[PDB]
Amino acid sequence: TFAGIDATKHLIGGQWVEGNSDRISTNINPYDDSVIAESKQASIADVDAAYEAAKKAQAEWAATPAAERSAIIYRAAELLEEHREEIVEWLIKESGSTRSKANLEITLAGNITKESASFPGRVHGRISPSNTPGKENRVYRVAKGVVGVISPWNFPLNLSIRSVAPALAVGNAVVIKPASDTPVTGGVIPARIFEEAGVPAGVISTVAGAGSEIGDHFVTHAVPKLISFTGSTPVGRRVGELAINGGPMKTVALELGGNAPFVVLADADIDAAAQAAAVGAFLHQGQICMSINRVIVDAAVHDEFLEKFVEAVKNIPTGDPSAGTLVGPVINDSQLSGLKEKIELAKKEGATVQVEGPIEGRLVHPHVFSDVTSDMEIAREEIFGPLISVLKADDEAHAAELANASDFGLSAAVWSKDIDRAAQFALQIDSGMVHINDRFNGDWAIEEFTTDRWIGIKR
Amino acid sequence: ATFAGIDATKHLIGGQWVEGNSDRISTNINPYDDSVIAESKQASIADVDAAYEAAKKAQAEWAATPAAERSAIIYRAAELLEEHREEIVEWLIKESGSTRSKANLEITLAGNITKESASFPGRVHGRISPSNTPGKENRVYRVAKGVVGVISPWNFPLNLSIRSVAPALAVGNAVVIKPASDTPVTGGVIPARIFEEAGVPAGVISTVAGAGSEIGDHFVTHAVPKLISFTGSTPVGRRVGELAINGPMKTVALELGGNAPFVVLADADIDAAAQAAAVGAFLHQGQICMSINRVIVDAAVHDEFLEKFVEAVKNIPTGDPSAEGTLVGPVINDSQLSGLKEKIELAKKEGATVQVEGPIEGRLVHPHVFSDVTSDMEIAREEIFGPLISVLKADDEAHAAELANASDFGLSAAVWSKDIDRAAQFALQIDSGMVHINDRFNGDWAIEEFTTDRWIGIK
Amino acid sequence: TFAGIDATKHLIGGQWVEGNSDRISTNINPYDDSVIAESKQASIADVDAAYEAAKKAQAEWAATPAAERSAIIYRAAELLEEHREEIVEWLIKESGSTRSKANLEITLAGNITKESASFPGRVHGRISPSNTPGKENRVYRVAKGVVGVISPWNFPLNLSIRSVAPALAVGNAVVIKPASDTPVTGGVIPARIFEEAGVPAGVISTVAGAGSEIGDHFVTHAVPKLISFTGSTPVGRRVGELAINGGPMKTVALELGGNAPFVVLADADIDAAAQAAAVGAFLHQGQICMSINRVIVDAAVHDEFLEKFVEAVKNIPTGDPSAEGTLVGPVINDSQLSGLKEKIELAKKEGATVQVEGPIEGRLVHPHVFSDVTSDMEIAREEIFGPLISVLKADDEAHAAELANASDFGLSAAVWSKDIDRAAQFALQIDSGMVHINDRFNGDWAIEEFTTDRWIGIKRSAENLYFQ
Amino acid sequence: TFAGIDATKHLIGGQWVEGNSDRISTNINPYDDSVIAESKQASIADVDAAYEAAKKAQAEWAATPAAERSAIIYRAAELLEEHREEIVEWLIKESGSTRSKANLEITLAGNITKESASFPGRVHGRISPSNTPGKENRVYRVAKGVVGVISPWNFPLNLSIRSVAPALAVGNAVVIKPASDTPVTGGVIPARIFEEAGVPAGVISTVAGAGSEIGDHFVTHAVPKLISFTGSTPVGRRVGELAIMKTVALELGGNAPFVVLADADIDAAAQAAAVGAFLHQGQICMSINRVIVDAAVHDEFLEKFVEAVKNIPTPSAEGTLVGPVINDSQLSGLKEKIELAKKEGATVQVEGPIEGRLVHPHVFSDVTSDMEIAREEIFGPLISVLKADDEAHAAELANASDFGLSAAVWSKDIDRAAQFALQIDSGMVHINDFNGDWAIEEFTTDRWIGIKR
């Protein structure tokens, strides 16, 4: 259960109901394998009801005055704190998250929701200039309509609120489809938080189900105007294809965390950078916008940084997430293999082990690898686990090439005392976000969940 | 074969007009009489690589060029559009089978877009956002995408290539054009040459014309372009979207002029609307921002409109495009002729009634109008690309709204109603980026589409 | 007293202190003449203290994270809503507001600040395009610095907050100089309420004194870089003039609600327009952006509208402010009283027709209506600030626009006409910032007003310009 | 005469006419005292006509299609370079500006009106959110109406077009009243060039009257919604006061600071102080009347700087960099300022002759903040070099003067430089070195129309 209803149901038509599918998925605590629950998953006829109920209820929502919608969204943020401990526990249980990680995730979901509540009072269309006598060009800024959000298992609550909150505050009706492993932290909870906040029936909905049964059908559907996806790149591609291959076509917003880079230039404060890289590599692992899985260091400070970086990660306790742990267990037994495979492959491709830990159950301990090249799989591919490569750049220009060598969407970080030069270097990296010496953009968000409707009026 | 002096069979690569390298020989045929215009050796995969490579090397300096400087060159190309008017008209008629008067409208259109584009350099700005962390400063820079790949259509080659080419170049992008194999000079050589003669540095503008499929895929699939602009058919746009997702992703902008509706409401000036529908359906076909392919009239005025409309379209001179009176020219090629032929047959087999028909000799398809059509019929739910019209009856106001949203794609739509205010509300009920009441390039939309925002946080 | 601090004190430096001038102020209830309180006023010295304190504290406040400044502003809205009953009683006792009018004022005050809480994260600067190779143009949007706010006796709470809240939220430090008749509702409550929400010491202040020794010096001081004024246009003009030739550099934002025209066109919903006119003229008078001082009606529907408007005005409860039904209370003071008595007579001795009029029992002026008036009668061209309304006859649609603009007060105007598309075109002819059709605080304009832009152009040589 | 038309007439109601004032003015070449021309001055009734006609012709011009307005404004930029040499002479002989300084002003003039030609398309309104059930909020952005522009004698062509072009493009009707000493460079030429460009009759006007007659009537007139003034801080003040019912925009040039921080490429910066002190004299945006330097590079800066100013040659010539002063009243002002400078203790680091109206460069040193030479607006080639004990002093010293549209700061640490720059209350600050979006705002007003459906 959660906040007053059993976390195994689905919020369809504003009614918490049981799934009509034949499949029954068993949610397993990644740490000790204890059954958390068993729910009758949803069928396509259920997704249909979800979407159709959203379409039918969306207009009245979009038409609700700015202040109202704002107040409700703001209420949701209050509720996030008011149910904090119950949410922390679920984060620990289902997501295999650490007590401290869960705490962060909730604060983060609350900042996004807090910003998002100002959105109503920020959506503006414009009155364009006319080129033909008697013509009035008005471009209204409206809600896209119905958004289908597909949340991941890494930061289930955080990365889902990242799109549910702005999408709802702006007038859209949303339908969440969480990852198989985290259906309540990535779907039931955020859904419930907004229902409890006042979001009208049909506006917020959640539908969980097996990939092979509803995955495709959720994207290819005719109701959603926008599909927001957060996950791994190969799955993003598939959702991307599906959105344009017989739908009709709908906009698809892909949040593909990949192999993010942490560049340390020659004039960087190796001390702070060491500390920082340790936080971004493990304490924030899973969070697509702050996580990093490879630090690129200049040759002139490489040996020093590597030294300090290793002595910093050896002190990262790996254990029972319920505890001072800072790195809990991996999510699936499928996710466990993959990591195992990458550790080996790095060793096999000639990488150098710098920090290795035991692997008990799904409790993978940190792993560091120096002497890594941009062509090694460990660096090219997406990791999503406590794996960490250290590549050497013998030139500042080479650092930029190393940083762009692997695909990654979200963020990139760089350390350098020369704020001005670093800022210039940052522009030399292909990322929409680059942070120097240490998020969520509201403007970028209101634009992603609204559409501009140009209405030409000839008098 | 020549244009503005230059050999028209060559390709502009690395700032140098050269002959293609593939063994494939393409013969350009006049659509109206089958006389050969030219015979150009096609561009090979290697040629596309050179174009993208050289373009990528010259882009930075072009992007570093002062705003006023870039805008002077964009304004010059607009003057050049006019100075070369006479000759572009001949090419438009000769290659794309355009009517002489249609050709003159297209050129006015093109030049009107690049003059508007001329003001873009001084309109591109970034933000300095507030921070939430002490001592942090957020600066989001608005820069060029880098290299932009432009695929243009055979319908309004000049005007639709320019629609992307001009703003992209204006904003700091370097661009490579891959025109439709039927209109390589009106869609590639002429646009490319106007900007070259206007002074955009070598390598910043290029055209590479090649035989479809493989070269087409390579062109979209390449690692250099960070944007692929496409205007054309939906099955092809679909394919471009696929390739952009599989086979190093890049944003893809698709301009698919599907089946645009022309909505006539009960209180509409039927005579005006009728004349307007005639203009949009036949004198503007091919221009996917002003054309319409189906009419939706309120029952209460369906018969009045139909008769008044049938009258109007029966007075449209079909025939040789060179003649100044003509308004309907030939269809671009035999294949397109086949689709038009079979679409007509099918409309009949589906239950449609012929209201206006004529003989089709050569590639000269006379205007056709069907009545008693339903939204499930393909004559009204699929792209048309030819002088074929459908008229659907709307027994209800809200019903008209349904039929208007019955098709897949749509750039614009139009509504007719004397009640200016109620019409504006109605228009909002249509899912189309553009809707014109009682009578089309968005500068802002073009800046956002051809630039990329870089958020850079500093501590 | 008000929420733990005695209303008689001034908030300087972050501390509620007693005044230092020798002049002693005596608060008087406009409905009965009670001594609400008596308190020593602030001297020219207390104004300097407040400004200097605000000046030094300003920067850290501006540097506070946006979300943090935002939470502080948001809570002020909550506290405003919390101390509702107390503020209500205070509005009625001092400003002479009505039970229900005071309650409306607080809602208004509340909405404004919850809207302002949104401001910190909305304030942004720009990176403009460059025309000279190697040059970067940044244009920062920052706080003005210190803002002095002069609040009026009409809607003291709502009109002070209208500028105090966005200014604070945006990073300014602000010193309030309330109207002499309403020092607590116009200064103490809003200051205290922001203090109890969390704004730092020195960032919010309230210096109250007799304009006689404080007024001019407040506007003239060298610290404030913006003066916000709300009141009569005469005083407003004096403020403006004083700001241009005193402390060389400081802008002024004058909010002068003079004679807002309420225009009823040929095709209006005369019955709805009638009730609305009634509302804007009495329940809302004092409220700068909502009230109306004159109504102009197309001749074709003039007499029809007049008959119905007079009816609704006739049945408007006038009396004791404390009562929950009253809609019109006493005038703030005798000076204003004698100003209205003078205006009613002047309208008469100019040939105007009385439609409605009542007794004037102890500062309690009953609603007064005058028809058959023309654009040059003082009653229809000067500002009123009282329950006196004048109806003018318009020959046609075009004459309506001309009658509407016969003022010099363009702050807001209302227009009634069933035809929306044309009424909107018509509204464009009126010389006001805002016009409302068939029945209002702009946040965007507010942030522009309390911030300043700083263009910083930086040229980089080859030396400190990399990867070029 | 200019570009055909009679240069002594006043464009009113679209027609160039002779003034109705019984006062005549003899426009005199500041350089040699020769009489360029004489003209019947404009009267109060003349002004009323120019404004009354402008008002009637405005609504039509604003409703003119955006791309149309933009082609007209653009044309004016072509006409400006077509009449280039003809205008160069007028600044040369009337404004007393050199040949290099005149040419520069024409390009700058061109740039402004060319940037301004893109304004019609960039003027957007807004459809704000609604808080009341079923209400729409439209915020139209319209032209103010009629704009009274008061240009000055320093850079009369550039500083008049600066207001005029943006205000016209946007759809306002403008009436220019130029400085008594420059009625054609600051009034006739700009008005005549927009006329040829295509601006309708009554949309552009120029009226040259006597300060004592027209001066006050031009500002307090009911018609103009905006008054754009450019000049000395004291006269800018009366204007604003007189204006208070319409809004006024004061471009008050005073004493712009040139701060040279301890790590400021003392050499290349000394080269720039020279340029911003003489080459860009009349330029209220590119000129500096004082240099604040940190003790460390103080003497280092001064030497190279003195040698810089000493090399500046001394109108109709090519080499010449500095020209004569506009009039006698101004001349006596500089001299008067030069003397009390010495009487205050300042060291005459540099001093040149005073042949006629031509004042040679003057540079003083060991100057402090409580001296009129660093406090008052100078309007002449008089430089003051103040020493700053540190950087904190530099901030104080920089903000000392009451008026400042722009400032300059040289450093090497671009980042710290930027930070320091924000500590100087000035609209503009340039580091080691015309805003359109702000001009668009200035010549338009936002009209909020709320509709309860």
Side-chain angles (χ1 to χ4, degrees), chain D residues 7 16 21 52 96 144 166 185 277 340 364 366 373 422 424 441:
Chain D
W16 292 94
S21 173
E52 221 60 52
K144 308 188 80 66
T185 39
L340 109 149
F364 300 88
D366 298 302
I373 187 63
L422 278 169
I424 303 171
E441 207 148 359

Side-chain angles (χ1 to χ4, degrees), chain B residues 248-272:
Chain B
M249 14 175 86
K250 333 99 172 301
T251 350
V252 61
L254 304 172
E255 308 307 313
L256 315 171
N259 206 114
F262 190 101
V263 182
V264 185
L265 300 169
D267 69 323
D269 182 330
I270 306 297
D271 280 301

Side-chain angles (χ1 to χ4, degrees), chain A residues 313 316-319 327-330 336 339-340 343 347 353 356-358 360-367 386-387:
Chain A
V313 310
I316 293 173
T318 313
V327 39
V330 171
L336 206 223
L339 238 53
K340 267 281 294 184
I343 296 167
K347 288 179 177 185
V353 175
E356 52 163 47
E360 47 247 21
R362 304 189 190 87
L363 248 186
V364 181
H365 280 235
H367 280 80
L387 253 298

Side-chain angles (χ1 to χ4, degrees), chain A residues 22 53 67 90 105 109 133 180 186 199 234 245-246 260 264 271 287 392-393 421 425 430 438 442 452:
Chain A
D22 261 36
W90 272 106
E105 179 164 330
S180 46
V199 172
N245 280 169
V264 181
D271 277 66
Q287 214 293 319
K392 188 195 291 183
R421 193 182 82 251
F425 173 81
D430 179 43
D438 71 321
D452 294 307

